[PDB]
Design a protein around this nucleic acid. Structure first.
Lengths: 86, 67, 80, 79, 162, 74, 82, 94, 85
RNA sequence: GGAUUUUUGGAGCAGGGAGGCAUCGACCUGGUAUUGCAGUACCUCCAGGAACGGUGC
């Protein structure tokens, strides 16, 4: 019916999980049939997705920037934070 | 669609295949699936002659010439 | 696809590509096909062990690409 | 220009003995004489053999139909 | 002709003959090395030949920079924190510059990956024991002035200066 | 033979004792009842040979096409 | 016949899904599409060898599904009618 | 043999590995001008030799006169102008 | 198409749904699902009842699952037998 | 109203085990050979040395 399930989360900050187990967090700006994704201001995490880990929240973080991810290698997505206003 | 490979025709190339496999040879032709014909092919070294590489298992190619 | 149009837009720009095997190729995107097949030039490649190399000319199959990093020059397709 | 499919058609006609590189399995390769093949690169091989590169051991198969899924590479052998 | 961001952005950029990404900064009459931030750490090699630089200093953190060609400048001193901004510096060509005292070459001891070093046509070259001094103080060097550092020289440099 | 293709070969082998190797190294011997367009395969009185040794006697069996490495008449 | 159609009817059910990568997902279906891409709410997701994390929303690419464990109550014979 | 963009070097210590030889050659010759490319093989025929190609011709002449007999990896190198024009030069010219 | 489901290799599934008989499914996850086929499709997606899942970890393990949906790509083999009997 | 460039799918499934073994590659010491005009899997050889590096079980 609605097709909205992806379009809803568009412009939002999104936590995307890759098939190797990486975590890509960026601004979800576009998708397609294959679920190839366009992620603005995107960083990569490896060790953790923090839920306020008292030791530290961030280890092996890398700044990537503007990322196009191929859908083949995507597993899943959740909402990480609201859209930046800019 | 065709892969845009006419530029690479009859040039010597370095082919990275899956399984950590690498071969080198001259591009003699291709089809829409990116299956290749490679002549004077060498397994990285032992000479295997003219061969068919299925596009499925082609990771990357690198020209050893200038196009 | 919308992402594909944005990829074609990056032709002529410096881009970074990671393969399915994690080799990292940075250089100028010459041609990008619809299926994500990528022709590049004057490459720096960074292997999984960390070592670098230099290549003049490369072509990578779309299927065997994990992702690409494009300039931020493009970010400014906001309609969708 | 030589098209890959045609090369095969040549292999077929020649009855050259063929050695196939399989997908994601390096320790074993397959050998045989292509009698026929189809649009999916599925091959009918005669007097076929499993070749163990590690063990230097050969397993005798006879009439084989190999799915094309496994094909990495096709080469000819003098034997 | 200050080494500026604008200068770096219009500079010839290419893949050199030894397959590395190199930036061409030759013949601009640059006096001071500065504003390298704008290269964005994208080069394996930087060619600063034929300029007027006095001190090999002023570099930002550049993790990919492995080769520095600094021919025909006026280098008379080497900065002290070089390894902190250039960790993988492997080749340093300083031919035809102004290093005069053996002690001025001391800061190169801190470049842990430095393997190819060339200091020819520098006054320092004619100082007594110049070769042995470099070998003992910069043991990580394997090729000095296009000649192989050999074991016998290492031992000999271990006696003198022990 | 004058060109003997995949499809006819398999069709000739229906009604016959076959062994199928799977990509994962399992092997299944039995009478080939049928095959379909996608090259899914149906065996009767199947036996399982793993490490080339009789493991299990299984009966009637469907093999999904993507699993198949090769088929042998035997 | 086309069983994805059956799954598309399961909005507002709670299920457990086992993934190809071993991950276990328990949540309430907001939507299944034609590619079996599945969307959920109130999700407790346990990657293999972690303690669960709770997410308000989760979206799964269809191909990454191994299987769905359905409510015992589910009236299959109703849902199989077209 | 007229002045040429490319210089032919021989009498080189052939024990140096090829990639190291080329990188030292590049380093040494950069002092006279931009070196476009270096051709050096270890075949029986070509071992102990190298072709060094410069963008500028004046650079090639200066290199030739100043490094004649320069001790490189232990041996005095012998330099000369190449017999033919380098493929890269011909492509860059036309 | 029905003809190909009826007489082709998938008749194994067609026969199991009609007779409400048990089948063992060898599965990609190295697990085996033992149960009855409520529905199936081209891809071998299935809706299964009274599923006994069995695996190994050496230690054997099992667990009962009344109602479940299997995506068909995970299928290695599907076995029909004197199992139901 | 599903037949190659998009929306009725070609994808899928498969990785832990242990606290020596196999294979390849530079490599480090001595000595030794080559003096020729090149666009490169690698590049003399003889002897010694590897508390070296990668991969698989």
């Amino acid at each position: 019916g609605k097709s909205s399930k992806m379009l809803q989360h568009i412009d939002y900050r999104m936590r995307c999980i890759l098939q190797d187990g990486r975590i890509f967090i960026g601004t979800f700006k576009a998708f397609d049939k294959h679920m190839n994704l366009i992620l603005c201001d995107c960083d990569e995490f490896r060790k953790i997705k923090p839920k306020n880990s008292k030791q530290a929240e961030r280890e092996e973080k890398r700044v990537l920037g503007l990322v196009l991810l191929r859908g083949e290698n995507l597993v899943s997505m959740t909402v990480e934070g609201p859209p930046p206003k800019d | 669609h065709p892969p845009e490979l006419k530029k690479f025709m009859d040039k010597k190339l370095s082919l990275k295949l899956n399984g950590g496999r690498h071969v080198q040879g001259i591009l003699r032709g291709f089809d829409p699936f990116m299956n290749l014909v490679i002549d004077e092919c060498v397994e990285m070294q032992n000479n295997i002659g003219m061969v068919v590489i299925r596009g499925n298992s082609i990771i990357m190619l690198e020209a050893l010439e200038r196009v | 696809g919308v992402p594909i149009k944005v990829l074609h837009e990056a032709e002529g720009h410096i881009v970074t590509c990671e393969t399915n095997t994690g080799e990292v190729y940075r250089g100028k995107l010459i041609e990008a096909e619809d299926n994500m097949n990528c022709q590049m030039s004057n490459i720096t490649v960074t292997y999984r062990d960390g070592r670098v190399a230099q290549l003049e000319q490369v072509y990578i199959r779309g299927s065997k690409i994990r992702f690409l990093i494009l300039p931020d020059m493009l970010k400014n397709m906001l309609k969708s | 220009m030589v098209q890959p499919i045609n090369l095969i058609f040549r292999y077929l006609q020649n009855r050259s003995r063929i050695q196939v590189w399989l997908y994601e399995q390096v320790n074993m390769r397959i050998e045989g004489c292509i009698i026929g093949f189809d649009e999916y690169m599925n091959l009918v091989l005669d007097d076929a053999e499993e070749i163990h590169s590690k063990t230097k051991s050969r397993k005798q198969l006879g009439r084989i139909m190999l799915k094309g899924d496994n094909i990495t590479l096709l080469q000819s052998v003098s034997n | 002709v200050k080494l500026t961001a604008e200068l770096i952005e219009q500079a010839a950029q290419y893949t050199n003959a030894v397959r590395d990404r190199e930036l061409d900064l030759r013949g601009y009459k640059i006096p001071v090395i500065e504003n390298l931030g704008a290269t964005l750490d994208q080069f394996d090699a930087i060619d600063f030949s034929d300029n007027e630089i006095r001190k090999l200093d002023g570099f930002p953190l550049l993790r990919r920079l492995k080769t520095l060609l600094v021919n025909n400048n006026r280098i008379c001193r080497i900065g002290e924190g070089l390894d902190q901004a250039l960790p993988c510096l492997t080749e340093l060509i300083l031919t035809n510059n102004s290093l005069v005292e053996l002690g001025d070459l001391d800061p190169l001891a801190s470049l842990k990956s430095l393997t190819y070093l060339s200091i020819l046509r520098n006054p320092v070259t004619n100082k007594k024991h110049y070769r042995l001094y470099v070998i003992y103080k910069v043991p990580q060097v394997r090729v000095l002035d296009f000649q192989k550092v050999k074991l016998k020289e290492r031992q000999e440099a271990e006696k003198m200066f022990k | 033979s004058l060109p003997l293709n995949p499809k006819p070969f398999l069709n000739g082998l229906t009604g016959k004792p076959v062994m199928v190797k799977l990509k994962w190294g399992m092997e299944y011997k039995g009478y080939l009842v049928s095959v379909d367009g996608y090259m899914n395969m149906q065996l009767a009185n199947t036996e399982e040979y793993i490490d080339g040794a009789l493991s299990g006697h299984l009966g009637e069996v469907l093999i999904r096409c993507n699993n198949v490495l090769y088929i042998r008449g035997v | 016949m086309k069983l994805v159609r059956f799954l598309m009817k399961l909005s507002h059910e709670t299920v457990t899904i086992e993934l190809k990568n071993g991950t276990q997902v328990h949540g309430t279906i907001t939507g299944v599409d034609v590619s079996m891409n599945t969307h959920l709410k109130a999700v407790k997701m346990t990657l293999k060898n972690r303690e669960p994390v709770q997410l308000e929303t989760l979206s799964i690419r269809g191909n990454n599904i191994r299987y769905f464990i359905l409510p015992d109550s589910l009236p299959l014979d109703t849902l199989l009618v077209d | 043999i007229r002045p040429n963009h490319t210089i032919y070097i021989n009498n080189m210590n052939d024990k140096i590995k090829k990639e190291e030889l080329k990188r030292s050659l590049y380093a040494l010759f950069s002092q006279f001008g931009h070196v476009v490319d270096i051709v050096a093989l270890k075949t029986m025929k070509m071992r102990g030799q190298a072709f060094v190609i410069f963008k500028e011709l004046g650079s090639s002449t200066n290199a030739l006169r100043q490094l004649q007999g320069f001790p490189f990896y232990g041996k005095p190198m012998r330099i000369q102008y190449a017999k033919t024009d380098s493929d890269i030069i011909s492509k860059m010219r036309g | 198409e029905e003809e190909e489901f009826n007489t082709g290799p998938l008749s194994v599934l067609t026969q199991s749904v009609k007779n409400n008989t048990q089948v063992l499914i060898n599965c990609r996850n190295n697990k085996k699902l033992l149960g009855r086929v409520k529905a199936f499709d081209r891809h071998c997606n299935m809706v299964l009842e009274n599923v006994k899942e069995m695996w190994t970890e050496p230690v054997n393990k099992d667990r009962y699952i009344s109602k479940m949906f299997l995506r068909g790509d995970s299928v290695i083999v599907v076995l029909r037998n004197p199992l139901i009997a």
